[PDB]
A paper describes a structure:
The green-light absorbing proteorhodopsin (GPR) was originally discovered in marine γ-proteobacteria as the first bacterial rhodopsin and as an example of a new type of bacterial phototrophy. The bacterial green-light absorbing proton pump proteorhodopsin (GPR) has emerged as a model protein for MRs and is used here to address these open questions using cryo-electron microscopy (cryo-EM) and molecular dynamics (MD) simulations.
To characterise this retinal-free state, hereafter referred to as proteoopsin (PO), we successfully expressed and purified an N-terminally truncated GPR version, lacking the signal peptide, without the addition of all-trans retinal. The oligomeric assembly of PO was confirmed by SEC and the lack of absorption around 525 nm demonstrated the absence of the retinal Schiff base These results collectively indicate that retinal-free PO is stable and oligomer formation is independent of chromophore binding. LC-MS scans from the enhanced product ion (EPI) mass spectra of N-hydroxydecanamide showed the specific ions at 188 m/z, 118 m/z and 104 m/z (recombined ions). This led to the identification of the unknown ligand as decanoic acid (capric acid) based on the detection of its hydroxylamine solvent reaction product N-hydroxydecanamide. Decanoate is non-covalently bound to PO, with its carboxylate group pointing towards the GPR Schiff base region and its acyl chain extending towards the extracellular end of TMH E. Instead of the retinal Schiff base, a salt bridge is formed through the engagement of the negatively charged carboxylate with the side chain of K232. Overall, similar dimensions to retinal and the interaction of its carboxylate group to K232 make decanoate a suitable temporary placeholder for retinal during the biogenesis of GPR when the chromophore is not available.
Numbering used by the authors:
A (entry chain B), B (entry chain C), C (entry chain D), D (entry chain E), E (entry chain A): 23 to 210, 216 to 251
Write the structure that this text describes.
Amino acid sequence: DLDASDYTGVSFWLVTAALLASTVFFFVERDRVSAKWKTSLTVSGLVTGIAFWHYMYMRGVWIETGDSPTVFRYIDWLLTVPLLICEFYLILAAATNVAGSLFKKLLVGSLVMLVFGYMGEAGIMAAWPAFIIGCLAWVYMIYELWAGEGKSACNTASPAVQSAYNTMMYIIIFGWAIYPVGYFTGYLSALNLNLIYNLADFVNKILFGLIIWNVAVKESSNAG
Amino acid sequence: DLDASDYTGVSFWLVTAALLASTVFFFVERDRVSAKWKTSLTVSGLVTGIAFWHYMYMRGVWIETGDSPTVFRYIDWLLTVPLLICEFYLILAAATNVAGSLFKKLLVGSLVMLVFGYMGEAGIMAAWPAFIIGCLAWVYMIYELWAGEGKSACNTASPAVQSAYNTMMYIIIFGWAIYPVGYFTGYLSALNLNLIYNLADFVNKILFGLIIWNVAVKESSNAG
Amino acid sequence: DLDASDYTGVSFWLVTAALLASTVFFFVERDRVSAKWKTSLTVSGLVTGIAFWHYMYMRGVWIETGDSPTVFRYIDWLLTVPLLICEFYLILAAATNVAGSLFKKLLVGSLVMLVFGYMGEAGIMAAWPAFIIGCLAWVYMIYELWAGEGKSACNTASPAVQSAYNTMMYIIIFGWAIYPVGYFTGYLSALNLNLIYNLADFVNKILFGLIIWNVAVKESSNAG
Amino acid sequence: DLDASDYTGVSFWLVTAALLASTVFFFVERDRVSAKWKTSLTVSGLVTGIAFWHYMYMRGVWIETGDSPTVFRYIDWLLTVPLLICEFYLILAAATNVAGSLFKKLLVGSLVMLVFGYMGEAGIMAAWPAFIIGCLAWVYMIYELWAGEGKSACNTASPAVQSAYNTMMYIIIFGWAIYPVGYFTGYLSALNLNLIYNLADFVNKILFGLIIWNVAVKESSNAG
Amino acid sequence: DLDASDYTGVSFWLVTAALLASTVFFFVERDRVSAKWKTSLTVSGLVTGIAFWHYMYMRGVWIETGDSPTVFRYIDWLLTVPLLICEFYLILAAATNVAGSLFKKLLVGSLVMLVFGYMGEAGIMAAWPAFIIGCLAWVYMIYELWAGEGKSACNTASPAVQSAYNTMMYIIIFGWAIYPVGYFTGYLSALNLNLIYNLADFVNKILFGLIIWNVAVKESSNAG
Ligand SMILES: CCCCCCCCCC(=O)O
Ligand SMILES: CCCCCCCCCC(=O)O
Ligand SMILES: CCCCCCCCCC(=O)O
Ligand SMILES: CCCCCCCCCC(=O)O
Ligand SMILES: CCCCCCCCCC(=O)O
């Protein structure tokens, strides 16, 4: 039985279980969605599925060592963040006709936020400059959602899709903002940084995928 | 081969097997249900699936240590109790048109019953005050089912759904009442408390999900 | 590589493999059956699935210890025998309209045959009285199938269902009779008792489920 | 990393991987086949699935010991050979109306070829008489395919099914002939016998199932 | 937590995760494709599924030993390269009517490129002659795609299929060219050779399968 002194150990176990439940939920709930939205729910399951597969290894590292598994942490982000950006393309493709140029601009900004974030936690370029650079890439992320191809594409979509797109954008706004909070807490320690990161994937990976499922089911029921 | 002296060890093994069978049953029996009820049977499978995944770890703790895995016990409840409350929303959504405000009132009451229950078993706020507080949150749970949005929503539903809603409410009445019985037995010991909790999840997690499956299949066959 | 001196070790391995193949067969062959019979093939897969999950543990006990895993044996029966009795209800429900009162009478008789059977193998109430009591509960089992609600329900069913019902009844007659044969052999030893029990689940769990699949496929093809 | 000196170790690993891929292929490719042929592709997956599950244990025995896992080898054949004979019945049932008396004659001949084959490799009845007896049962196998109920049933089938039936018969002719070649090589040693047996299951279990899939897909596309 | 000094260890972990995600994606995304293209997405899942199953063993070898798992590397190629060549046949079969003689010419050339490639890494026929011979078989591979049955078959296909066929041919051109680059780097060392091979399967096994999925989904949506 798990300890009750270290909240981080509880979070590693709690989150890991939630990502396993979410992965099964997303892959199974593709029956309720139309063939256009089936790809959107698959990518959500992959994000939670990869994150769960990465959290199992990270949970062992915490018990065996007690230090933050930074290398395992950022490798998972390097694989799941592009798939989350793909969700913006998929919903605008399963509802409207979008070429997808906004995908490239968001993907480049996301990679910059992750590449510099890993370097700061590894001692490269100290930590304060990394926090500023990671923030600026996050600032570029929010700007392209206010004005871009997606904003033009979201205008012609159904009101249900528009509400989802705004909610997903908010998640980029508030949810992705909590990562710099954990970065600030853990370097400006390790126990709180891992706790915040654990809770972050609860929102940015599970709540993000639940918004996709809700809009897909509403649209699919309309068609039947 | 399992011992025959400790009934708790038998129950840990017997329950764990039943939750694995129930998990496969719920995820597979989504073929017999309409697309509206497919989400209801998925959540039932998640509850049994998470509980099974938690009972495997708890079974090891009992053999390795011999003490009650309280931390593993309440973490599972913290994850499965909200999903069981979601079943009340889902059945009223797959049968009627419900906004779902009763979900919030039940969820808040359920969390209070679990947060204080864990503290009592950990020595926080003794045990007698925790039993009273946990009972009162359980008393609030039954009151909102007698009068609330669900009661208004259940009135307009089909007689098959109404029978299920009443049966689910009963399970809240009798089934959830057995947890304070185990709490009273184990602190007012460990062998009986774990035995009762094991048997409790047999009713509140498996019988609860079988009521959902029965009503979903009856409704789906009517539509075809 | 497995030994060639102890036929029991071969049977534990040979049966365990057959139950894994049967479990996959039953859960996969639900595509060929109508939505009414899909529940019948699920329960067959659960019986073989639980039995396989129990035979894996029993196989280890035999190699590690060399004694009969009685406690693991009867726990599996306590979980799978009710599901086999449920098959009588399901086929009469997927073919006719049956209330299901015969289910209670068979279930009570089955539990008596298992409760006293475990006690005899554990030294409770010796072994000779347990064999007589277990036989009488088995004698009550066959009487209710000759005359009962199922016999009334089987009359109105299709000739394909009637042939299956008679075949399933026979399995209760001959197949369930082999368990007292192993009980008599092992106490009136261990090597032969485990060998018979291993072969018994080959008929009463796999051949029983193949009869269900055959009748379900014949009926489903008629509807299309 | 695997050794490059012992070709048998490579074959055990190479075959085991092919049977896992074939098992997933057969169970997944049931979407492309009509409900009549879905049972035929299931049995092919069971044969490869059981063989894969048996090859994993045999691969360990080879590394741990270095001797031929004869007992594990023949137990797999005792379970998969009847299922391969069932393929002749299934294809003639999913294409024509066949009672299936040829199944009994082939099954009896197959069991004789396996029972005596195991005895020869265990020292019972030497090895030369076992090779002759095993050959004669194989000679009876080919005779009943030239003239029997299947030959009468294959006449009325579609030309696509007839080509498959002839190809399957050939596999009995050439493919099953390679087992006595390995038996002759290994006793008239162990390294070559295991290598031949490994390659034999590549043809008689995978190529056999690919013929079933090819004919099922051609027939299903005709119906749509 | 993984080391940050050896990029090869990161690549082994990063690739292995991508192949697991790709395998689930390909087998799940068969819902969005027509029954003609379902076989094409299955083979893509098998390639990534076998490669993932092989990368798990190779990752252990790298940590345990630190040397290149050449034998495990080429066995995976011996099993996955023919399946990738089968993709050219499948897409031309699910879109047009092709006999498939170009499959034999490409398969023979592919095997020559792999047989000689393994020998060079094992010291057989040195390394420089192996690089030249492996290049020539790769040169024969590109020539038959410019002129062959596939080029004749691709002419009559839809413009969507033609774009996919050209993209797949390019992957043969650029993607398969990176293997000799790693061969040249690692012998004309081990750290860079494994890194290149890891990245190679990211393109030639995942990007190759994503081209198949994209064209299958576009064609299936047209039919509905
Ligand atoms: C200032 C530090 C910024 C860190 C950003 C971390 C991004 C994580 C993205 C996500 O998990 O979906
Ligand atoms: C007075 C103690 C109350 C304890 C309540 C425990 C709640 C468990 C809920 C459930 O398992 O679904
Ligand atoms: C006289 C002893 C009777 C033993 C009965 C054992 C029942 C097993 C039931 C079954 O396996 O489905
Ligand atoms: C003369 C020896 C004959 C050996 C026959 C072995 C049969 C194997 C059948 C098969 O693997 O499908
Ligand atoms: C000159 C050396 C050529 C090496 C070719 C290796 C082929 C790998 C094929 C592939 O991975 O799909």
